[PDB]
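in:
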């Protein structure tokens, strides 16, 4: 209440083509990660993404608890990497920053900021800060 709006603000203000939030959800005998919120999406395929623990770009970020930066998806990610990151394929991202969302002293979800069509990541994305901009969540800085 309301994460969609905040997501739009960040994407609109920081000038990204795409933004999304990954959060934990209850599954049968296993918690899963889904892309619950999205801004500037080109289709609705991301809604169908269900990730087992540790999997996907979101899972990589949740596991390491530190941000992941990809200036150029095409050149930096292997075929295997790309296949294992469905939202990247689904949204046609050519560059992206993924940031761990921390609730309390625990890594919780992930914020993805992405670009399309070869548009570079905005200058300063490397030290983008979640705190006081996404409700309760903070990033890995000061952890």
């Amino acid at each position: 209440f309301d994460y969609q709006d905040a997501l739009d603000e960040i994407r609109e203000t920081e000038k990204f083509d795409f933004a999304a939030i990954a959060l934990p959800e209850d599954g049968l005998h296993s918690a899963v990660i889904k892309w619950k919120y999205a801004s500037g999406n080109i289709n609705y395929r991301y809604r169908m993404i269900v990730l087992r623990p540790g999997k996907g770009l979101a899972g990589l970020v949740i596991r390491t608890g530190s941000r992941k930066i990809v200036e150029d998806v095409d050149a930096e990610l292997s075929q295997n990497d790309k296949l294992g990151y469905p939202i990247v394929l689904s949204e046609a991202l050519t560059a992206m920053v993924a940031i761990p969302l921390w609730k309390n002293n625990r890594v919780y979800g992930a914020l993805l900021l992405g670009q399309r069509e070869g548009r570079p990541l905005p200058e300063g994305s490397t030290t983008f800060r979640i705190n006081q901009r996404l409700g309760s969540f903070t990033d890995e800085i000061n952890k």
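note: The chain has one domain: 1-143.
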